[PDB]
Amino acid sequence: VTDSEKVAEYLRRATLDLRAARQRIRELESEPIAIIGMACRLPGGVDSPEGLWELVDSGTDAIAGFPLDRGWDVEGMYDPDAEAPGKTYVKEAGFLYDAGEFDAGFFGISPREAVSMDPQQRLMLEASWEAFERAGLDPARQRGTATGVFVGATATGYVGAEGFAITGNMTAVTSGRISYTLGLQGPAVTIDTACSSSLVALHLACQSLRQGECTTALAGGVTVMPTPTAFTEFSRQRGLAPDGRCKSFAAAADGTNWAEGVAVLVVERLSDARRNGHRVLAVVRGTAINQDGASNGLSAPNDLAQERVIRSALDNAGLTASDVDAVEAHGTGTTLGDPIEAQALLAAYGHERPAHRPLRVGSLKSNIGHAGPAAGVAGVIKMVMAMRHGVLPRSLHIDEPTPQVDWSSGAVTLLTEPVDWPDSDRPRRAGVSAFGISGTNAHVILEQAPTQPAPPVPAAPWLLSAKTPAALRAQARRLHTHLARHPHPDPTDIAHALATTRTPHEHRAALVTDDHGTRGPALAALAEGAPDACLISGTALSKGRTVFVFPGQGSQWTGMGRELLHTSPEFAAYIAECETALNDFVDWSLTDVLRGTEGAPGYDRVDVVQPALFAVMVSLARLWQHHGIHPDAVIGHSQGEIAAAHIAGALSLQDAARIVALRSQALLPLAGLGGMTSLALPHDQALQLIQPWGQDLSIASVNGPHSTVVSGTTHALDELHTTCDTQGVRARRIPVDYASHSAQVESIRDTVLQAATGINPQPTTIPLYSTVTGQPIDGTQLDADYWYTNLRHTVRFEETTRALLGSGHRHFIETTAHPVLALALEETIEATGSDARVTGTLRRDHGDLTQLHTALATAWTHGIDVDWTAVLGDRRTPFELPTYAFQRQRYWLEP
Template identity: 35%
Template sequence: MSDRVAVVGMSIRAANVRNTADFWRLISTGRSGRQEISPEDLARRGVPERRYKNPAYVPVEFPMADALACDLRAFGFTRPEAELTDPQHRVMLEACYRAVESSGCFIGSLPDRVGVFLGSRTTDYGARIEYRSAAADRDLDTAGLAIGTDPDYMSSRISYAYGLTGPSMTVLTACSSSSVAVHLACQAILAGECDAALAGGVAVNVRDAGYLFAENGIYSPRGRCEPYTAAADGTVDGNGVAVLFLRRLDAALAAGNPILGVVTGTAVNNDGRERAGFTAPGVAGQTELIEEALDVAELSASAIGLLEGHGSGTRIGDALEIEAATQAFRSSGAEAGECRLHSVKANIGNLTAAAGAAGIIGSLLALKHGEIPPNAPLVAGGTPTDLRGTPFSLADRPTPWPRSDRGRYAAVSSFGLGGTNAHVVIGDAEREVRLAERKGRSWQLLPLSADDPERLAATVDAARETVAGATADTRRDIGHTLRTGRPQLTTRATALIPVDGSAADVRWPARERFHAAPEGPPALVFMLPGDDVPAPDAARALYEAEPVFRATVDDGLAVMEEVLAPETFAAVRDAFRHGASRQDGLADTPLTTRPVLHLLATGQHAFLADLGIGPDLLVGHGVGELTAARLSGVLSSEDAARAVCRRAQTLADAHEGAEAAVRFTRQMREVRLHAPTTPTLSSATGTWLTAEEACDPGYWGAQPGEPAAPDDAVRTLAAEHPGAVCLQLGGGTSLLRAARLAGAAEDTTLAVLPEGEAAPGHSLLRTVGDLWERGIRIDWDAYAERDHARRIDTLPREFDRTPCLHPVLQDHGPGTDPAERTGKQVGR
C-alpha cells in the first residue's frame, strides 16, 4: 500500500469561473471576478432602498453563475425535494461529480471505497422557507427541509446519491473547513479507511448583493479584497465551490488517472488561548502548524516555491500571517525572497468554507502550467506590503516555474475564525507517472451519450473540436476515458476516429443518427448466413486487426486442414492470411465460401463475446445453421468446423441427392450432439429447435441442400421478439432483408460486413458502437485489455441549467437576481 496520496481530479466554480480552465485564465492574468452593483440593479433584485442607500452599504459581489440551477434527473431529485434542498447542497452534488469526472472516471461506478469530507457556509435558506411557509399558512415537509438544508446531511447526501461507502462527514471550521477536510481525507486514505476521497467546500449565498461594513470589522469598506498590499482594509465574501478527488497513489497509477500532484504533508492545529481574542489570529499556532506540515512532508522550507496564503486582506490578519510564516520558514532554512506569496482571494473573494480547496486547486494549476500567477492587486496597480527581510516576494506578472530534479512544491495555509488552522503541502507528480504506458488500436471508438438530443449535439460538437487538435496519444486517451470513465446515458451516438491521420476524415454522427437506448437491454439475435460471400479482403482485414478474431480463426483452420483437400484449404487459409485467392474461380465455390463464412462468423462471435456481447437468440440459414449449432453449444468448435467442411462438400456434390444425405447423417452420428444452450430457430421447421432435434443426427443429415429461404423462421422471430436487435455475422445482409420483410425495423437490423461496402479492419469496432447505441451492454473494461491509455479530463457531461427555488421564495428573495430564478439554458 502506498504511503502517499495523489490528487487525481478537481472542480471549481466561482465568480467568472465555470471550471478549472476558467480559473487558470483568471488567476494567471491577475484578473478578478468582482462586480459592482448599480442602484437600479439592487432595486430590481428587491434590495430595500433604505439598505442600499445606507452610507455603510458596500454594493459589490463575487457572483457564481447558475447558483440556483439543478439537473433534477441527473442527481435523482423530484422537484419538491430539490426545492427543499439548500442550493449549496445541490451545487456540491455537481462539484463532486465534476471532480471525479475530471479524473477520467464516473462517480457512479467507482471501484474503490470512497470517503466524503466536505464543508459548507451557513445560510438561511431553510429558515426563510420555514418563515415564509408559516406566514402563508402553507404545509411544509419539515423533515425534508432539515435533510435538505442542515449541513449535517450534505456529505451523507453525496455518499447516498453516488453509492460511496467510505467515511462521510461534514467539516465545519469556518474558513479552514475545506483544508481540514483535505487533511482528514488524506488521513483516512493512509489509515486504510478508504482508497479514495472527495474533499472540499462550498460557499454560496444566492441573495448575495453587497453588505454593510462595520468600523474595525473584517469586511472591506471599499469592497476590495487585496491581500498583502498597503491598501488592504478587509475581506469580501465570494461565492463558489471547490472539490478535490484524492486517491491512494499506487491505485491512481494502476488506474491510469491523471496525477495532478502529490500531497506530501498536512497538519491541523488550534491556536488555543495564545491570541488576543477568540476572533484574533495567533502567531505561535500558525508557526507551529507550518513547521509540523514541513516535517511531515520531510522538506525544508527552501523547497517551497509558492506559498498560497490565507490572505484574508485584513491588515492585522495579513501581518500576523506573514510574521508566523516567516518564523516557520526561517527555522527551516529558507532564504530571503525565495518563495512567492499569493492568495486567490484577490481573484474570487473569500470563499470561506471552500477557500482552502480553491487555494490548493490554484497551486495545482500553477504546477501544471509551470507558472506562478501574479498577485491580482499588483496587476491593477496596487502597492505591495513591505516584505523586506522575509522569505517571501510578490509580483505583478506571472513567474516561470520550470520543473527541476529537486521537484517543485507549493504550500497552502488556511486559518479559521476561532483558531483552527490547516496547512497542506503538495508536490510534483513522479517521473514514472509521465511515462505511463499506452496501448491501443489504430482506430478509437468514441461512445457519446447525453440525457437528450440537444445535449448530445453539444457533446458531439465538443468532441469534434477536441479531436481536431489532439495528438495521437491524446486521441487514445479520449477514447479510453469515454469508454471506461463516463456514464452510459440514454441518448447515444458513436464515432470512429483515427489515432493517426486527419480528423477531417471522421464521419461525426448527425442528429438524425442519434439513438434512444431503452431502459433495459433489448434481445440480441445473431443471424448466421449460409451463402453470403463477403467482399474481397474482408476476412483478412479483420484477421490482421483483432487478435481474438485471429486466434479463433487459426483454431478453426487447424481443424479444417485435416478435412479439406490441400488446394481447397489453401484457398480458405489465403482468404484470411494472404488475401483471397481467385485461381480457377475456386474461392467462389461452396467448397471455400462456406468454410470462410463459418470462420468469419465464429471469429466475430469470439471478438464480441470477449466484450461481454452474446446472443439471446440464434437463427441460421443452410451452413449457417451449423455455425448457430456451434454458438449454441450443440456442436463443439472442432466438430462444427468439420461439419461445415463436409456440408460444403455435399453442396459441391449436390447431384448425389439422397446418397449425400445418407452420408451426412452417418457422419453426424460420429459426433456428440447437445441440447442448445441459446434458443435457436430452425430454418427447416420455422420454429424453435428442440433438444430432441438438436441431438438427432437425422435432423442434420436431412439437409443436404440449402433451404430456399428462412422465411418461416424469421417470421417467428419478428412475431415473438418485435423489439430485438438483429446482427448478421459472417458477411452480407440476406437474413436481415428477410427480417425486414417480416416486420423488423431497419434501424434494429445490423450487419458486420454489409455487401457492397469496403471492409476496413475496424468493422467490428463499428459494430460494437452500433450495438451500444441501441442499448446492448458492452464490457468496456474487457475492451480496455486490448485498448487502454491514460484517463484524462475531457468532454464533460452536459447538465441542465433549470433554476429551482422553493415557491414561497420566488417573490421573497431580496438580493437574488430575478433572471437567475427563471432563466433556462444548457451548459457544461
C-alpha cells in the same frame, strides 16, 4: 551446515522483516496523498481549474455587483454609514450568478425537490461529478466503493414536497447526498469550522486515507449566500472593505469581502494512484491543524498559533522551511489580520533560507474575495495549477507592501508581478493556509507530482454519450473545442479515454474512421447534428437479450475475410482451427480459398461455398464473443443452422465441419437440375401462386411477412418467372444451381443420411432456435434425420424470429460477411411493434478492421455492452477530456 550461515539466514529474514515494518510505519504515519482530480466553480465565470488558472494568470478581478434575481432589494439596502440595521456600505462582492442553475434531470431529482433543495447541495453534487470525471474515474462505476466525502459547509438558511424540504436544507445532508446519489460507501462527514472548514476537511480526509478506511476521498467546501445577512450584520463593526476589494498584504488593506464558491478534490494515496495508473496532479505531503486558544478576543488571530501550525505541517510533511518555494497566504485583507499573518510567515518560513530565493506570498482572495469555507481548498487548486504551469500568478491590489510588518529580513516577498517558477534541483513545493475566524488554523503542504507504450489500433472508435440529444450535441461541441487547442493528440488515447473513463448514457454516438482528417468534421457534424458518413447515432435499449443470426446462402464475395487474416490475429487463429478441423473430408485448404491463391477453387462451386461460409461465419461469431458480446441465443437458416449448432455447443467443430462438408458434397448431383427464386409476397399468396405448377415447386423459405423464396426445377422456375412478370412481382433469381428445400433432395436422401452419420450431439449451452421446428430445440435431437429435414422441409425463419421477439430478444447480430437477412428481420420487427435492432459484421468490399470496429460501434450504440478493453488495449496514457455538458435550469425559492 555451519552455525554461522544458519544464523546469518535468520538475520537476513529478521532485517528484511524489520525493513518492511519500518516502511509500513512510514506509510502509516505520513504517506504522500495524491490529488488525482479537482473541480471548482468560483466567481468571475470560473467553472474549472483551467478557468481559475486563466483568471489568476490574467490578473482579473472577479468582484462585481450584487445579484438581482435572488429577490434582494439591492437598491434599498445600501447606505454609506457603517451603523444601521439591514443596510451595508459594500456595493460589490464575488458571486455565483449561476448558483441556482442545476441539472436536476441528470441526478434523477424532480423539479419540485430541486426547488426545495439547498444550492450548496446542488453545487456540491455537480462539482463532485466533475471532479470524478476529471480524475479519469467513471462516476457511475464508483457505486459501492469505499469512498469518503468530507465537506466544509455552513447552514446559510436557504429557506407535495414536504419530505424533500427536510433533507434538502440540513447541512449534514450536504456531504451525505453526495454519497447517496453516487452510491459511495465511505464515511460522509460535513465539517463546519468557518473559513478553515474545507482545508480542515482535507486534513481529515488524509487521515481517512492513511488508516485504510477509504480508497478515495472527496475533500472540499461550498459557500452560498441566499440572503444578504452576511453583508448587513457583519458590516456593523466596519469588518468589510468600503470598495469591496480584499487588499491582501497591502497598505490600503481596510477590510475583507465575502464571496460564494465551491471547490472539491478527489484525493487518493500516492501508492494507490500509481498502482491504478491515475494522473497525479499534486501531492499533499503533510498537514496540520490547531487552535489559537488564548487570544485577544474570540475573533482575533494569534501569530504564535500560526507559527505552530506551519511548523507542525512542515514536520509532518518532512520538509524544511527553505524547501517550500511559495505560500498561498490566507490574506483576508483586514487591517489587524494581515500583519499577524505576515509576522507568522516571516517567523516560520522566512528565517533560514538563501537570500536569492525569498518565499513568494500570494492570496487568491485578492482575485475573488473571501470565498468562505470553500476558500482554503480553492487555494490549493490555484497552487496546483500554477505548479502545473510553473508560473506564480500575481496578487492584485498591492500598491506596496503594508508597513505594519517589517520586510527588512527580505526572506518573504509578495507576488506584486508574476514570477517564473524554477524547475531545477528539486520538485516544486508550496503551502496553503486557511486560518479561521473561530480560531482553528490549518496549513497544507503541496509537492509537485512525480515523473512517471502500445501500438496504435487502427480506426479506434470515438464514443460519445449523453442523457438527452441536446446534451450529446453539447458534448460533441465541447470535445471538438477541447481537441482544437491540443497539438495533435493521439487518437487511440482519446478513444480509450472516451470508452473507459466515461459513463455510457442513453443517447449514444460513435465516430469510426481510419484517417485523422474526417474526425474533426465528423465531430462538427455531430455538433450541429447533420449526418456524416463516419458518424453513427442511436438510443441504447435498457433491456434486451442478444441473438446471433446465421444466414445461409447469399452472403459471399471474393476476398471476404482476407484482410482480417492479416490484421486480426484472433480471426486468423479461428480460421486456422476451422481449417484443421475441415482438412479431413475436404480436398483443399480453406486459407487458400479465402486468400484466393492460384489454383484454389472459386466460390462458384457448390461444394466449397458452404464450408467456406460456415468457417467464416463461425470465426466471426467467435470474434464477436472475444469482444465480450456473448449471445443469449442463436438462429440458423438452412446450412447456417450447422454453424449455429457449433456456437450452441450442440456439435463440436469436427462434427460441424463433417456435416457441412459432406452435405455440400452430397448436393453435387443436384447441380443444374433446378434453382431458387426470391419473390416479395406473403406466405399465403406465394403458396397459392404455385398451385398451377402443383408439386413441381415448393416454398423453400419464408424469410419475412413480404419476402419468400420458392425452389424448384428450372422449367417450372422460368415458367413462373413470366407469370410473376404478368402479375408484377419482383421475383429475384438467387444465383444458385441447386433446388434445395424441395422434392429433388429426396433423390439424395440416403447420401445425406450418410453425411451426418457418426456425429455426437450434446445439450446446448446457449439456447438454439431451430428454424425447422420454430421453437427451441434440445441439443441431443440434432441427429442425421434432423439435418435431412433441415435440407428438405421449408425454412420458417419468420415464425422463428417472431418467437424470438416474443421471448424478449432485442439485439439481432448477423455474423456473415455481408447482411442478407437484415431486410427480412427489419420487416418482421416493424410488423410486430417491437423496438429490436439489427446489425451486421461486414459488407461487400469492406472487410478490414475498420468495418469490424464500425460494426462494434454500431452494436454499442444500440446498447450492447461491448468490452472495449479488448479492442483498445488494457491501459494507455491518461488523456484528459472535458467533463459532462450539464443542461442546467434555474431553481430558486421566491421570497
